[PDB]
């Protein structure tokens, strides 16, 4: 059994199926909240999954994720809420106006940790951001902006299955799950 | 004495300047690391101030300070260094373009603990951001669009003296002195 502190269920959900071919191991919510650092996502999820597990003692994961727009040098990235908030997806088609570069990624970084320590576990996926909202009501924040590696629709107007295999979340999963089947 | 985990010296320069008087005069950098956490600028010189006695044991100070400017919603906030280095003065501008409400504010958090716990205080500056960077050296980061209160020049336009009376960071400190003052 491993824990997953975070408020959102959807979350643990996520996480099961990914790994439901491990009969061995089962994902569960822990409401137990941490403090995310400043920084880039592995030092917020080292950091949350080492305060966690010093609260829990128990196998656990925390994750963070973040968006990257090449021109903007990162940003808006470990800040991706935050600026998707107070200046949303707007804010990043203004700051990209007139841009060559239109280049950005997704990634997640998987905070996991237990008796022996934490372990990192990562996903990107690199793509382009659209000059428009392109929208099908299918994703959240900037996924109406975002164009994946060769598609030419963005994640918002992608279904979960067709976003199933290529998303970042996927594949810190993926990195993750090898950790526990390679398990000793 | 008092210590102030900082790495830069020229913020005890200024604190033992402004707390002169104060036959206590006695403001000390020791270099001591914290997380800085996301939240608020409170929250972060909170967590901090508390981290940092809690190695040292020893009267603490730390500071956070932020440039928030109205249309943006607060933005950037407590994120005013990562935004500035990743998209600048130029990516607030951009921002703000045919934008009329280019109200903003400048504000430090000061941190102080003891054996008692922590104490915050403040300091603000309102202003407005210019619709270009102007300066003559003075000043970092967005001092270069900033006016203050009733002025023309930015903060970079003007000299240390010339914003005596005009810096959040004097004001906080200036806060810092009356709680000084009252338990000496």
Redesign the interface.
Known sequence: KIYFATGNPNKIKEANIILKDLKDVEIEQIKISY????GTLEEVAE?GAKWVYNILKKPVIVEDSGFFVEA????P???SK??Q???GNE?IL??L?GKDNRNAYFKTVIGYCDENGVRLFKGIVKGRVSEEIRSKGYGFAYDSIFIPEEEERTFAEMTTEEKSQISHRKKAFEEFKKFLLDRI
Chains 1, 2 share one sequence.
């Open positions: 403090p995310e650092i400043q950091f903007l040098n990162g940003f990235g470990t800040y935050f600026v908030e107070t200046i804010g203004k700051l106006e």
